[PDB]
């Protein structure tokens, strides 16, 4: 039912999964300047039960008053090294800074597949540590694509993931196919790759015989879903398999099945630092009657200030695709956050994540705005 019930149930399982894996102490000698490399060396001989142990992280030539400080910094720093795209272990589909991150099929060859196993164990360690109690919380610092989260849960790929994971591709190709006739496009169930000299390098079929299968109006939805499967899952099959192999050593895959993609983000990354003042200061209201701009919007901000931290997180997922702002906050959004006045009355709010944008109808009372905004994020 509720998200907190899922978390409470999930965390209690996990404490039972690790019940004869003691939280005894283990030392991790790492270096700030070569953090990912030294962390892999420090854990290279860890057994499965060793990953359940209390991590005592020693930063080289650094003294600390307690172990909690270095541990929390190590978790945050190792999350950034793994998932912030800099080392190309993960990548983004557009060279933007809001873009969600995805496993990289075309990474530098020195990043071997066992590094995705480490990343999976690290994420599982965050979930395990956080299930020990509030004082042991370790949040995953990453803004994952929805399709990668869907692959963690074991869901099939769908073209809807393009809007959040590759907004430019969704706005160009996907939206065109969804809205237009295909009889003259001469598309087939295959992808063409060209070299840097503009020559056809390779043809990759979306299924057996796909190059001889035309895309028609009657099958174009199956084409888009098979396109999502190829572009978001098939090309990273081994990377995801090794990630899941590491994750499932600490978190059995059956346990994550009770969450959907967005709930999995909240479980891993938390409800975030959603500042309503930063929200209001960077959101542009587009159009609308006087009643909307001067009364409905005032009701809106009062509602937003009354939302629980989870509801705030779901509002950002509803409108931007992730519960976490980009590094720069609300100012760092692809197109700046816009609240569009919908030309409807007393209807449900809608959103277009590839434009961020929240589409807000006009309402007749505060409690109507309260009711409808909670429904739209429910």
Swiss-Prot record:
Active site per the UniProt annotation: 354
Residues forming coiled coils: none
Superkingdom of the source species: Eukaryota
Phenotypic consequence of residue 354 to A: Failure to form ubiquitin thioester complex
Post-translational modification remark: Autoubiquitinated in vitro in the presence of E2 enzyme UBE2D1/UBCH5A.
Domain HECT positions: 47-378
Region (Interaction with SOCS2): 47-353
Subunit structure: Interacts with SOCS2. Interacts (via HECT domain) with HTRA2, DIABLO/SMAC and SEPTIN4; in the cytoplasm following induction of apoptosis.
Function according to Swiss-Prot or TrEMBL: E3 ubiquitin-protein ligase that catalyzes 'Lys-11'- or 'Lys-33'-linked polyubiquitin chains, with some preference for 'Lys-33' linkages. E3 ubiquitin-protein ligases accept ubiquitin from an E2 ubiquitin-conjugating enzyme in the form of a thioester and then directly transfers the ubiquitin to targeted substrates. Ubiquitinates SEPTIN4, DIABLO/SMAC and HTRA2 in vitro. Modulates pulmonary inflammation by targeting SOCS2 for ubiquitination and subsequent degradation by the proteasome.
Record-given protein name: Apoptosis-resistant E3 ubiquitin protein ligase 1
Organism annotation: Homo sapiens (Human)
Residues of the full protein shown: 437 to 814 of 823
């Amino acid at each position: 039912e509720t998200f907190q019930d899922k978390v409470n149930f999930f965390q209690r399982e996990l404490r039972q999964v690790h019940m004869k894996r003691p939280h005894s102490k283990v030392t991790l000698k790492v270096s700030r300047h070569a953090l990912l490399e030294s962390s892999l060396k420090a854990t290279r001989n860890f057994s499965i039960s060793d990953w359940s142990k209390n991590f005592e992280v020693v930063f080289q030539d650094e003294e600390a008053l307690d172990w909690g400080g270095p541990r929390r910094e190590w978790f945050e720093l190792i999350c950034k090294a793994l998932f912030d795209t800099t080392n190309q272990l993960f990548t983004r589909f557009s060279d933007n800074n809001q873009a969600l991150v995805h496993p990289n099929p075309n990474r530098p060859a020195h990043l071997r597949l066992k590094m995705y196993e480490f990343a999976g164990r690290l994420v599982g360690k965050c979930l395990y540590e956080s299930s020990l109690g509030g004082a042991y919380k370790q949040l995953v610092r990453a803004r994952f694509t929805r399709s990668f989260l869907a692959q963690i849960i074991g869901l099939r790929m769908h073209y809807k993931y393009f809007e959040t994971d590759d907004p430019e591709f969704y706005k160009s190709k996907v939206c065109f196919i969804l809205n237009n006739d295909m009889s003259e496009m001469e598309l087939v169930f295959a992808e063409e790759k060209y070299n840097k000299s503009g020559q056809l390098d390779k043809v990759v079929e979306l299924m057996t015989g796909g190059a001889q299968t035309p895309v028609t109006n009657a099958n174009k939805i199956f084409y888009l879903n098979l396109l999502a499967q190829y572009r978001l899952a098939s090309q990273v099959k081994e990377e995801v398999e090794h990630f899941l192999k590491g994750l499932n050593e600490l978190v059995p895959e059956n346990l994550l099945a009770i969450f959907d993609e967005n709930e999995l983000e909240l479980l891993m990354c938390g409800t975030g630092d959603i500042s309503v003042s930063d929200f209001k200061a960077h959101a542009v209201v587009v159009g609308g009657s006087w009643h909307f701009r001067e009364k409905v919007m005032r009701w809106f901000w009062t509602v937003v200030s009354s939302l629980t931290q989870e509801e705030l997180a779901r509002l950002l997922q509803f409108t931007t695709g992730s519960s976490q702002l980009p590094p720069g906050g609300f100012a760092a959004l692809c197109p700046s956050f816009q609240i569009i006045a919908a030309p409807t009355h007393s209807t449900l709010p809608t959103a277009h994540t590839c434009f961020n944008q929240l589409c807000l109808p006009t309402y007749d009372s505060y409690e109507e705005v309260h009711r409808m905004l909670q429904l739209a994020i429910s």
